Design a protein around this nucleic acid. Structure first.
Lengths: 633, 48, 185
RNA sequence: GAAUUUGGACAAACUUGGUCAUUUAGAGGAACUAAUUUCCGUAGGUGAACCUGCGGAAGGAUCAUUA
RNA sequence: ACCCACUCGGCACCUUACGAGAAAUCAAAGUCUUUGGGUUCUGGGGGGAGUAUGGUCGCAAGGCUGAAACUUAAAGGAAUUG
RNA sequence: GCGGUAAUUCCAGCUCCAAUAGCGUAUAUUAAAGUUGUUGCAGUUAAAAAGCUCGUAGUUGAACUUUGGGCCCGGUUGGCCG
RNA sequence: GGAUAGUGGCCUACCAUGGUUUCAACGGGUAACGGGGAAUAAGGGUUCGAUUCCGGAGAGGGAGCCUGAGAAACGGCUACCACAUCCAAGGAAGGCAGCAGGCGCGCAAAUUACCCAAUCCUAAUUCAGGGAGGUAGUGACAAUAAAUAACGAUACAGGGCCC
RNA sequence: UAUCUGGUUGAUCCUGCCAGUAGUCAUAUGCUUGUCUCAAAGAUUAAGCCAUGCAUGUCUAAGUAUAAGCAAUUUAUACAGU
């Protein structure tokens, strides 16, 4: 009842809201502060072939005023557990190799800062360096700092030495314009601000990266407990949301694994509730989920309506030709008049409108994958992933910033690809509950900036969504919002407007960004990048419909309406395709009626007015089915 | 989702641009990268 | 902290922005007097607005009053020495009847054309901002100069800066040396 | 002439009660949204547009007869 | 008691339109852009709402006072016309 | 408000305009606003005259009290007078 | 009477019952330091003024005090509260709302630069000193002026029209 | 430097607000950005916390120097210049 609640000076007592925020601001910064329980991760990437980025760390650690210049000798380590006295911070500085492009992309897929080298002398590489900036920039950067490091920033130019700073600031903004200036490392306090910013500025979170616990391995070793498999020993700092023993875990270029125990530096093993290295397989649980929909050959009338090296380059010229013509007359199959148009079009189903009609979700298909019932069905994906992240909070045994020796069930088959954790970056990413097992997913492709070559619809494309990377032959569709969730299949991909791919792959629960590429092993750096995109959701009900358009000409007008030239060939073509209506190019609708077919001609009926030297087109629709996918290592 | 947008109102002191039932603020800048310039393809947008 | 430097803007923007008379009538001024912006007209509207204000207040005062006689005669005399106002109209009732073509009559850009040897009124402006023309001992490179009617008998080409003498310049150097001398090898 | 020491004003501050307002995790609850004649005042009544009693207003459509 | 004339005060009609007004109409709603005789109260788009809350008076019914967040491009007055 | 389809408003290409080293948007504020009213509003019917009267503070409050005539002195303006 | 540098309920003792108010006390609020000013330009106003000058107040929060002519002084001290630093653990030490920097916060704000040469200030003092102040850096806060083209010939269409 | 124009209707005249317009030494932001003169700049939220460096010292013929400091000793182991 009492509702004055006015005229108060204790408003100042709403400084307690300023103490809760400062309290959380300190409770953010327990993890990164101290000689104990702390590490930053920094990566130095030269965007030129030049520079040999050792010297970036040389210039950048002159301003420590310590004995951290004793490490960084000519002795090559590439990961440095450097503490700085002057800022009470401890850094894990990484330099990846310039050859392995995937080392670069999988480095900043762990990092917290990405210090970019630039050059005064040699321009930024268009085909390699720019691709580094774009690709890091689309997989997600925690934080990022620009650096000019040439002596010839002065030594070339006593010609008012700065002006290259406008070119590199100005160049450097065009990717990420949250950066005002590009720091010089050839003067003192400029380098100091770089060092400060590394030490004490917070890096932001990356949502998929921090909703999965992950370590950076400081020591790897293998323990035999089995004659082929065994146990690993991995020492590192937990930085993500954390770990539980009952999850799996993931390593890039090795795949998914199942860890055994976790040491804390209380030890937990993995009990009953741990998940396995399969899909939702079980080989008898399919036929408990029984289905109905049969499009048999019952009815020799009545299509389904429910009435109301140089040879591959010649293949490339074939793909450019088929996309070139498939632009101009899209979905228009060209019947051979010699061959009967019945056998070709047996499985097709004609529709008034895709958007309005309703399919029962599957059918007695048999061009589906038989593992269709071996797929995890999802309700509301939002009401899946917030629940799973909710269980990940409440059941994380490993708080971040804790040192862990990690015990992973691991084969002796795979020790021969392991390197030491100094010259490279064996780093281990956690997973979530159902992030191992297969369901029908959806991405959202868009083309790369330089890229203009055509992409067909089921050629294989490597997809890096989050950390894992699969080899995927996709299914493309334009983005639209039909209520039945039934969308038109694409045979090639658009010039610019963002489409949707679809395939079968195991699920992400974080909607990670994705880069799409094909491997280019003969070419330059090991990848010709195709596109970038974002994991939309896991929808099994995303029904793509293959559209095939049969096209005819009229001969003689004014009588009923119109006849047929090129549409059909036989009077067998009547009975299948003449309950199915028909469209034209700002015209009429429906119901061709029979005549001769002995030469070619089918005397059509319509609804409307205008007819001239024009075309006449009908349609038939068929579901496309997803293809299963494999990892890429 | 979970990005950093800068808001400003439409220009009516709140209510509408038009038919819109109860939406009053427009987004000016995502991730500090200025939707005008992205829409005109002058900068790029890094993720987070 | 030291005294604030005082400053004040000159032009005055028009109140109705798209007004079919004004948009067209200004542009005739832009044509004949060769001005780069409509702002260069607005500045003249503002100077005229201050003379019309200062004149308009003095007419509320009486004759034989020292403020009107003094400030009045200073106003008028200051406008006579710039040649905006003519000579017979020293009354102060007339200084309200001025208009923009009287100030724009006296820009140096047009004084060089009306004066002679600048053939156009655009060629005149280029002669100004390219350091050629002068007023006296002094060079002027700024068009909006308001030649003060005593200096009309002094406007000429500069002592330096050819058209005025002693040198040919840059382009005649490259021609007469690096083509005509280039015929010698 | 140091430590120390009695009383005094000046007094920060503490501990208990009661009391008020406010953030704060917060087990739960309660709900919450999206897949015709016109009146006024007043009293009573019916699932409901409503009906009835008393007083008031037109914000409502006066032709004839008076020699 | 009439009848006639005149006058003071009252209730009204009726007629002009001199002025007023958006108009219907008005001896005042006139003498207010040629914008000041004296004074009291009220309103400042429409809903939210005469509601919520607080006082306050009432045995009670209720009266007095009376917001805001919010939502909206109209809501309303006079008059003519098939 | 334009576009259920021969788009003056959507998408581009030309062309044009306006401002010009500046231009555009949000928010506030002033003008516009005689929608704050002293100058200067409105209250029959559009929002608004309080149910009437008394009555204190407040605001405002009839007229009237040496007027005129002589008389020089006495500075300015204007002039044939120059 | 005490106290004060000094009048004074400033404070003590005794005595009296007063003092302010709808000409709005008192209480509440202020995203309120006050002015000189600023913005808007018919007049009349309305809105703003943390911000270069004057005046006040504060130096994390309150309190107390030393020394001095002048401090309730914080680039002085003492205690308590709240924070927080080094520690060998016994103790020791501190307040950028000076300057430059950070960190948070935010829609929102630059250099850990050069110098006492001006301006003036301080001392026993022309000399020493001064992030008072100045100079440069950053700076599309705001202002002022104003480049991105001027002129010929030839030729086609003119509008004139030279006599 | 004394100005309004679109929106309520079949069409009208109105009350009326909404929107448009211009200024802002009022801040923010977006896109651009060649010259000169000038110049604000952690006020708004958080009088929130601060690493380091620096911001307060001071001398003349003229208070006191046995520096076991320096210089020429040079007028003088009374001192006596700095």
């Amino acid at each position: 009842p009492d509702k004055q609640v006015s005229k108060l000076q204790r408003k100042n007592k709403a400084k307690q809201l300023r103490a809760q925020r400062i309290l959380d601001s300190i409770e953010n910064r327990k993890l990164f502060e101290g000689k104990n329980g702390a590490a930053k991760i920094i990566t130095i990437v030269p965007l030129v072939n030049d520079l040999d980025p050792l010297d970036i760390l040389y210039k950048l650690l002159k301003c420590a005023d310590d004995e951290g210049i004793m490490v960084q000798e000519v002795d090559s380590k590439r990961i440095f557990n450097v503490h700085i006295k002057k800022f009470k911070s401890n850094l894990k500085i990484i330099i990846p190799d310039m050859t392995n492009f995937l080392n670069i992309l999988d480095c900043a897929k762990v990092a917290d800062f990405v210090v970019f080298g630039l050059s005064g002398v040699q321009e930024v590489d268009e085909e390699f360096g720019e691709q580094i900036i774009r690709a890091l920039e689309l997989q997600g950067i925690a934080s990022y700092i620009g650096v000019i490091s040439n002596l010839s920033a002065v030594h070339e130019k006593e010609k008012f030495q700065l002006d290259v700073k406008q070119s590199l600031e100005s160049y450097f903004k065009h990717f990420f314009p949250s950066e005002e200036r590009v720091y010089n490392l050839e003067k003192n306090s400029d380098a100091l601000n770089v060092l400060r910013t590394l030490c004490q500025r917070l890096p932001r979170s990356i949502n998929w990266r921090d909703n999965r616990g992950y370590v950076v391995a400081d020591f790897v070793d293998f323990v035999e407990t089995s004659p082929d498999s065994g146990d690993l020993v991995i020492e590192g700092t937990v930085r993500g949301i954390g770990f539980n023993a009952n999850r799996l875990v993931h390593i890039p270029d090795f795949g998914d694994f199942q860890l055994n125990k976790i040491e804390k530096i209380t030890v937990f093993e993995s009990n009953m509730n741990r998940d396995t290295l399969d899909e939702y397989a079980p080989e008898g649980t399919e036929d408990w989920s029984d289905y109905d929909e049969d499009f048999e050959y019952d009815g020799l009338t009545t299509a389904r309506y429910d009435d109301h090296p140089e040879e591959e380059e010649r293949q490339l010229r074939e793909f450019r030709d088929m996309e070139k013509e498939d632009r101009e007359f899209p979905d228009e199959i060209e019947l051979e008049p010699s061959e009967s148009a019945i056998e070709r079009l047996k499985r097709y189903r004609g529709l008034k409108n895709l958007y309005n009609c309703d399919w029962q979700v599957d059918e007695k298909d048999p061009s589906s994958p038989a593992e269709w019932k071996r797929l995890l069905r999802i309700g509301n994906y939002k009401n899946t992933k917030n629940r799973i992240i909710k269980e990940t909070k409440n059941e994380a045994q490993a708080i971040a910033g804790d040192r862990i020796r990690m015990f992973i069930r691991f084969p002796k088959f795979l020790l021969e690809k392991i390197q030491d954790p100094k010259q490279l970056l064996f780093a281990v990413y956690g997973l979530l509950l159902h992030e191992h097992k297969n369901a029908v997913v959806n991405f959202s492709l868009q083309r790369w900036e330089q890229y203009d070559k055509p992409v067909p619809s089921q050629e294989p494309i490597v997809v890096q969504y989050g950390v894992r990377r699969y080899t995927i032959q996709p299914l493309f569709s334009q983005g639209s919002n039909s209520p039945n969730n039934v969308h038109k299949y694409e045979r090639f991909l658009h010039p610019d407007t963002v489409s949707v791919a679809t395939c079968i792959a195991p699920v992400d629960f974080t909607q990670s960004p994705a880069i799409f590429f094909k491997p280019s092993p003969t070419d330059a750096k090991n990848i010709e990048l195709i596109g970038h995109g974002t994991f939309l959701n896991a929808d099994h009900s995303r029904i793509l419909a293959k559209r095939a358009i049969l096209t005819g000409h009229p001969f003689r007008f004014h009588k009923t309406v119109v006849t047929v030239r090129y549409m059909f060939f036989r009077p067998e073509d009547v009975e299948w395709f003449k309950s199915i209506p028909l469209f034209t190019k700002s015209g009429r609708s429906g119901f061709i009626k029979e005549s001769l077919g002995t030469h070619g001609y089918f005397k059509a009926t319509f609804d409307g007015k205008l007819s001239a030297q024009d075309v006449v087109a009908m349609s038939l629709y068929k579901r496309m089915w997803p293809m299963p996918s494999l990892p890429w290592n | 989702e979970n990005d950093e947008v800068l808001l400003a109102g439409f220009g009516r002191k709140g209510k509408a641009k038009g038919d819109i039932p109860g939406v009053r603020f427009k987004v000016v800048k995502v991730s500090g990268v200025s939707l005008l310039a992205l829409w005109k393809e002058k900068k790029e947008k890094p993720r987070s | 902290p030291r005294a604030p430097r005082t400053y004040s803007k000159t032009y005055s923007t028009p109140k109705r922005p798209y007004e079919s008379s004004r948009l067209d009538a200004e542009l005739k001024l832009a044509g004949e007097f060769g001005l780069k912006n409509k702002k260069e007209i607005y500045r003249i509207s503002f100077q005229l607005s201050k003379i019309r204000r200062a004149a308009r207040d003095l007419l509320t005062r009486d004759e034989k009053d020292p403020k009107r006689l003094f400030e009045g005669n200073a106003l008028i005399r200051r406008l006579v020495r710039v040649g905006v106002l003519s000579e017979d109209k020293k009354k102060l009732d007339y200084v309200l009847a001025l208009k923009v073509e009287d100030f724009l009559e006296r820009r140096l850009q047009t004084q060089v054309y009306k004066l002679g040897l600048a053939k156009s009124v655009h060629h005149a402006r280029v002669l100004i901002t390219q350091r050629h023309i002068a007023v006296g001992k002094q060079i002027v490179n700024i068009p909006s100069f308001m030649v003060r009617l005593d200096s009309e008998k002094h406007i000429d080409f500069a002592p330096t800066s050819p058209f005025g003498g002693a040198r040919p310049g840059r382009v005649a150097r490259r021609n007469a040396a690096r083509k005509a001398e280039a015929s010698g090898e």
